[PDB]
Amino acid sequence: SLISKEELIKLAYSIRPRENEYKTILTNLDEYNKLTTNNNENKYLQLKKLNESIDVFMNKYKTSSRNRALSNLKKDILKEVILIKNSNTSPVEKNLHFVWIGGEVSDIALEYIKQWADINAEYNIKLWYDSEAFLVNTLKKAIVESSTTEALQLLEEEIQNPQFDNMKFYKKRMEFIYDRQKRFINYYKSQINKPTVPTIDDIIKSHLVSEYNRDETVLESYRTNSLRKINSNHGIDIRANSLFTEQELLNIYSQELLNRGNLAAASDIVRLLALKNFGGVYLDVDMLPGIHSDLFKTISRPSSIGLDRWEMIKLEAIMKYKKYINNYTSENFDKLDQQLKDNFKLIIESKSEKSEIFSKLENLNVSDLEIKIAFALGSVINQALISKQGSYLTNLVIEQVKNRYQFLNQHLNPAIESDNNFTDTTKIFHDSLFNSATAENSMFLTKIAPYLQVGFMPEARSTISLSGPGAYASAYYDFINLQENTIEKTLKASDLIEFKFPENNLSQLTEQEINSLWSFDQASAKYQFEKYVRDYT
Numbered sequence: 001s002l003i004s005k006e007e008l009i010k011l012a013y014s015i016r017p018r019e020n021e022y023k024t025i026l027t028n029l030d031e032y033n034k035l036t037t038n039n040n041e042n043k044y045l046q047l048k049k050l051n052e053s054i055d056v057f058m059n060k061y062k063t064s065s066r067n068r069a070l071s072n073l074k075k076d077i078l079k080e081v082i083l084i085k086n087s088n089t090s091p092v093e094k095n096l097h098f099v100w101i102g103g104e105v106s107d108i109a110l111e112y113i114k115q116w117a118d119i120n121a122e123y124n125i126k127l128w129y130d131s132e133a134f135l136v137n138t139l140k141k142a143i144v145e146s147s148t149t150e151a152l153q154l155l156e157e158e159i160q161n162p163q164f165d166n167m168k169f170y171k172k173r174m175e176f177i178y179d180r181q182k183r184f185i186n187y188y189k190s191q192i193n194k195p196t197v198p199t200i201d202d203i204i205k206s207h208l209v210s211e212y213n214r215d216e217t218v219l220e221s222y223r224t225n226s227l228r229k230i231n232s233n234h235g236i237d238i239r240a241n242s243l244f245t246e247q248e249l250l251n252i253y254s255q256e257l258l259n260r261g262n263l264a265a266a267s268d269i270v271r272l273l274a275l276k277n278f279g280g281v282y283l284d285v286d287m288l289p290g291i292h293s294d295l296f297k298t299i300s301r302p303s304s305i306g307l308d309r310w311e312m313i314k315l316e317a318i319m320k321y322k323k324y325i326n327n328y329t330s331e332n333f334d335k336l337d338q339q340l341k342d343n344f345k346l347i348i349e350s351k352s353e354k355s356e357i358f359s360k361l362e363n364l365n366v367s368d369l370e371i372k373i374a375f376a377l378g379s380v381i382n383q384a385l386i387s388k389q390g391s392y393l394t395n396l397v398i399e400q401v402k403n404r405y406q407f408l409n410q411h412l413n414p415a416i417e418s419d420n421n422f423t424d425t426t427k428i429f430h431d432s433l434f435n436s437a438t439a440e441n442s443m444f445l446t447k448i449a450p451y452l453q454v455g456f457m458p459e460a461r462s463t464i465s466l467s468g469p470g471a472y473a474s475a476y477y478d479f480i481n482l483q484e485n486t487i488e489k490t491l492k493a494s495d496l497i498e499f500k501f502p503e504n505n506l507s508q509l510t511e512q513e514i515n516s517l518w519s520f521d522q523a524s525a526k527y528q529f530e531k532y533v534r535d536y537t
Contacts, residue, residue, distance in 0.1 A: 002076055005030040012069035021057040022066060028053045029073075040369050041392050043084050048482040051077050081480065085370060091363035092386050095280025096120070098234075099128045099270050102263040103137035104226040108512060109285040110233055111325045119289050119358050126278070127234040128243075128270055133257055134226040135204040135219060139184065140261035142212045144456065147176035152536050159533065166529040170457045177456050178422035183211070185259055200258065243273050249398070252405045256467070262455055268467035271385065272398050275371070279389030281364065286512035287384050288315065289358040290505045299343050302336075311509040317344040318357055329511045361505055369393060369479075373472055374501045374508060378493065380469050380476070383508065384501050396475040396484075403485040404466050408448055411436070426452065444487050458525040461518065 003011075005026050012022070028050040035046060054070050054077075061067070096116055100109060105127065117125055151173035158164055188203050201223055208214040244250040249269065256265040271282045291314055301310040312332055319328035321344070333341070351357050364386050366372060371393040374384040387394045415429035429452075433445050447470075450460035464470050476499060477489045 002029065002033055002080060003073065004033060008069065008073065011072075012066040014065045016064070019057065019061065019064075021053070021060060025050070025053045025057055025070070040084055040088060040367070044081065044369060044392065044482075047077055047080055047084070051482045077482070078480065081482065085367045087367075089365040089367055090388075092281065092366050092388055093279035094120075094123045095278050096123050096125045097128065097271065097274040097278070097280055097282045098126070098285050099267045099274070099282075100230065100285060101128070101130045101136070101238075101266055101270065102133055102257070104134070104222065105129070105230050105233065106285075108325075112285055112288060112510070112512065113234070115288055115324060115354075115358065116283070118354055120361050123280075123361065125234040126236045126274065127230060128238055128274055129230045129235050130200075130257070130266075131227065131237040131239050132199040132201055133204075134223045135201045135208070136257060136261060137263060138219070138222070139204050139208060140455075142208060142214075143177055143180040143184070143261070146212070147173050147180060148532055149536075150176045152532060166525055167458075169529055169532075170525060174453050174456050175422040178425070178452065181259065181261070182419075188258060238270060238273075243270070243277065248402060249273070252401065252467075255405075255409075260452075260454070262463065265454075265463050265467045268382065268463070269401070271382070272394065272401070275385060275387045276390060276394050276398065279387060279391075281361065282382075282385040284383040284513070284516075286510050286516050288507040288510050289361075290503070290507055291315070291318070292357065292359050293504055295357060296344070296347065298347070299340065302340075308509055311507070312511075312514070315507060315510060317341075318348055321345055321348040322354070322357070324354065359504060364502075364505070366391075370499060371397065371472075371475075372499050372501050374506060376508065380472050380496070380499075382469055382472055383513075384506055386501060393475060393479050396478050397472050399485060400471040400475045400478070401467050404444075404448075404471060407436075407441075407444075408451060408466065412451065422452070441487050458520045458522050460520075 008026065008029060018026075028046075032043075032046045032050050035043060037043060051074060054074055057064070058067050058070055098109075098113055100106075113125065113127065116123070151169055152159070154172055155169055158168065184204075184207055187207055188200075191198055191203050191206075205214075205216060205219045205223070208219060209216050238244065244253065253266055253269045256262045256269070274280075275282055296314055301307070305313070309332060313336070316328065316330050316333035319325050320330050320333055333344070336344075348357070366386055366388055368388045369392045370387065371391055372386040373380045373382060375381065376383075411432040412429050414432065415425045418425065418428055420428065430449060433449060437445055444465055447465040448462045450457065451462040451466075454460045454462050473490050474486050474488070476496060477486050477491055478484055480491055480495055481489075
């Protein structure tokens with residue numbers, strides 16, 4: 001039990017009469033100690049109220065002799081948060097949530113989902129989609145294809161220089177992309193309020209037929225097949241479900257889905273609302289179940305093969321002899337020495353059920369306050385998540401995302417609404433953005449500065465800091481330190497580790513995972529540019 005009001009009175013001594021702010025601390029402490037509630041969030045919020053009142057005092061009376069005792073109380077409060085979190089756990093809701101928005105769900109994605117379904121038959125599978133937006137990826141590809149050609153045409157003379165910097169290509173192409181996105185967006189805005197009440201796909205189809213030489217019947221067949229396919233495979237529509245109830249969040253989702261065509265960012269929003277509203281486990285479609293821990297304990301990893309590649313090899317081995325997933329790569333497995341291969345084969349073929357190879361989730365016991373997350377390279381990654389319905393931490397991540405977009409949009413909206421070209425819009429946005437820099441936010445600003453070109457130019461990675469892992473990392477800081485909307489503070493490793501998605505419950509290093517991971521550095525830019533120039537007519 002936290003120290004009593006009477007004990008703090010002893011320790012927090014001063015020649016001075018009790019300050020109002022100190023009386024408030026004592027009341028808040030007493031009221032925490034006297035709580036009869038069994039509600040963990042209620043307890044946490046009272047602790048937060050107390051902690052905040054301590055900071056008010058210490059920041060106002062910076063040389064008070066009470067500060068040593070108050071600082072010690074703050075250290076005890078950090079521990080109390082952990083006691084509350086670990087005081088109670090119970091199994092997460094037996095739901096698996098996947099998301100595929102913006103086009104036809106791939107056969108490969110369905111094969112990966114099937115592994116989870118087969119192994120966890122008692123879990124309810126939801127494959128979230130947007131019933132109005134099956135043509136978003138088609139539109140983005142059309143815009144990028146057209147802009148690539150335009151940029152090569154404009155730059156043809158300059159490209160013959162052996163010292164041509166492909167960044168001029170990516171920059172010029174982004175100018176064409178931005179203008180094409182703007183023409184679509186403005187057309188959308190002119191139509192969306194009509195009494196005919198058109199859908200997003202109605203508008204995309206019209207625009208593609210008008211401006212991109214597409215056939216209406218072909219596009220409609222793709223749209224209806226996409227809808228049938230996803231509904232036949234655990235599909236649940238975000239729109240029919242009314243998953244969004246906050247206009248602010250719907251607007252964030254829409255700015256990614258419609259204005260930017262960033263389906264990854266759109267899915268970042270949907271996965272959070274799915275967990276908030278239903279609870280369970282969120283998985284990217286390239287995640288696979290964990291392999292039984294002892295399955296390959298009798299095979300030793302060669303010194304020449306790294307830890308991650310060895311994980312890849314285990315899955316390659318399984319899929320070579322079981323073929324659960326069709327045409328799975330055997331690239332790394334095939335390079336193994338023959339006795340190792342023979343060894344994998346004996347073990348794998350000795351098993352008769354898939355349940356002898358992959359392990360079940362069973363009960364994933366969590367605190368009702370928390371969210372758990374996958375790690376990659378010691379950092380959180382939102383490709384897999386666990387949370388009970390309505391958890392405080394999931395709500396903190398949502399609050400982080402809202403706060404980050406509010407800041408982004410405060411600076412970006414006036415620039416976009418000026419209706420300038422890409423170059424001038426970017427300058428207006430940046431000038432406003434960087435004039436708001438502080439010691440607290442400066443790296444955040446730098447990370448969101450290239451927002452408009454995410455997905456289209458190398459090294460533009462703003463998503464991480466808006467809807468992705470950065471929002472989660474800051475929410476964990478918020479949780480542990482009883483704060484709200486911190487920006488660039490992060491936990492030490494030992495405070496973060498308790499929130500890790502259990503390793504035995506997840507195979508992250510899959511063939512599709514390795515393909516789908518961000519690679520648009522300067523080296524990939526050069527390779528893509530070579531292929532563009534090669535294919536240029």
